[PDB]
Symmetry: C3
Amino acid sequence: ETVREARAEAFVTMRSETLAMIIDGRHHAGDVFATARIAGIQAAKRTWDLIPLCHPLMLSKVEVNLQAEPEHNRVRIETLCRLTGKTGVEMEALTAASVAALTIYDMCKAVQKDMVIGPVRLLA
Amino acid sequence: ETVREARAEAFVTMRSETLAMIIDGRHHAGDVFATARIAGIQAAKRTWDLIPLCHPLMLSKVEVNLQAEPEHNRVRIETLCRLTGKTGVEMEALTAASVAALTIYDMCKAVQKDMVIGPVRLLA
Amino acid sequence: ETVREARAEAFVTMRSETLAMIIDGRHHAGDVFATARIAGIQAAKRTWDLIPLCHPLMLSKVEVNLQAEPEHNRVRIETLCRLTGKTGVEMEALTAASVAALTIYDMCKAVQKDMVIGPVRLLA
Ligand SMILES: Nc1nc2c(c(=O)[nH]1)N[C@H]1N2[C@@H]2O[C@H](COP(=O)(O)OP(=O)(O)OP(=O)(O)O)[C@@]1(O)[C@H]2O
Ligand SMILES: Nc1nc2c(c(=O)[nH]1)N[C@H]1N2[C@@H]2O[C@H](COP(=O)(O)OP(=O)(O)OP(=O)(O)O)[C@@]1(O)[C@H]2O
Ligand SMILES: Nc1nc2c(c(=O)[nH]1)N[C@H]1N2[C@@H]2O[C@H](COP(=O)(O)OP(=O)(O)OP(=O)(O)O)[C@@]1(O)[C@H]2O
């Protein structure tokens, strides 16, 4: 039994107006980043129930951080998962990143029909 | 890693007729107290999934006890949660008490529109 | 804290045509056995949430195996559950077997109205 951790990233690519709306609605009720962070945290804790062969685990830590990248017309999501145990937490990190990305998508899709999620991958 | 425990209480205040109906339907199919106890136990085990920042834990014990207080026109709910681990179980105890209270409410609301839940708090 | 395990079996009895359809659709998209295995695995991990008094546990292993028994006009399901902990996994094994059986039933019920599930029991 050891300390295990994993980090993942995801991106959501969108038009400039769409990203500007996220930036302008930040820190207000309906905060896209706040909502996506909570969604990702909740999703990480449910990973065992979403991915058939994953084991139930006791996550002691899940972090989801989001940043606008206006220069690339996209949002970057980075996640961190940690626990002390025998099973790793790669899928928790990826699932948290993915559901955070889907939540950004959900909150922007009225404005834009052709957003793209990706890449979604582990960080070294 | 130690033995951790928490106790909570909740109250549901109602008219005398409403409480009398609970007392009279006790030990029969549709037992309000039996249903509320099971709801509270189930809710305690799901606390991590209801409260965003709570950690998943392995509850080894959850107890929910209910008593009519005819003298005060109310039901009192007391809960107990225990486990051996590194994280406490205050939220499990409060959530079990709260959902037990909501279940009493649900089973009585046809009869009464203005029941009040509270206080809900930890016990020392 | 020790290694704990449990094994269960379940049977679904059906007409010969119904069983033949399962055998003939095996290894194809809509594989009844593949679907039932995944359902049973997922169900085992949720046992604590289905059975009110069961404890949440960290299952390290769940196996679900299915075999056609043409000679008896039935499907046999055998399950295995294991973990290292203080609480046994009998209910996880039985629940995995039961939900696997219900999934076989679901996937065959258009064809047959009078299938029977049982026995469902622990193995020694
Ligand atoms: N929650 C959660 N669970 C996880 C992962 C995760 O990131 N998060 N990674 C691992 N894990 C689940 O188990 C896989 C690894 O298999 P395992 O080594 O536990 O199987 P064993 O019991 O050793 O036996 P074999 O099956 O190896 O023979 C796996 O790749 C998942 O399927
Ligand atoms: N199921 C469940 N979970 C619970 C509680 C509960 O009653 N029941 N209480 C605790 N806990 C969750 O974690 C909170 C306490 O934070 P923590 O001390 O674990 O965080 P750490 O990993 O130490 O890092 P920081 O974030 O402290 O820097 C908390 O207050 C909950 O948010
Ligand atoms: N997931 C899951 N959980 C399980 C089982 C299972 O197969 N799978 N078997 C056990 N268990 C739940 O706990 C029952 C056994 O009770 P227990 O010995 O834990 O209670 P204690 O805390 O010792 O106190 P008392 O209540 O004994 O006084 C039980 O029979 C279940 O109710």
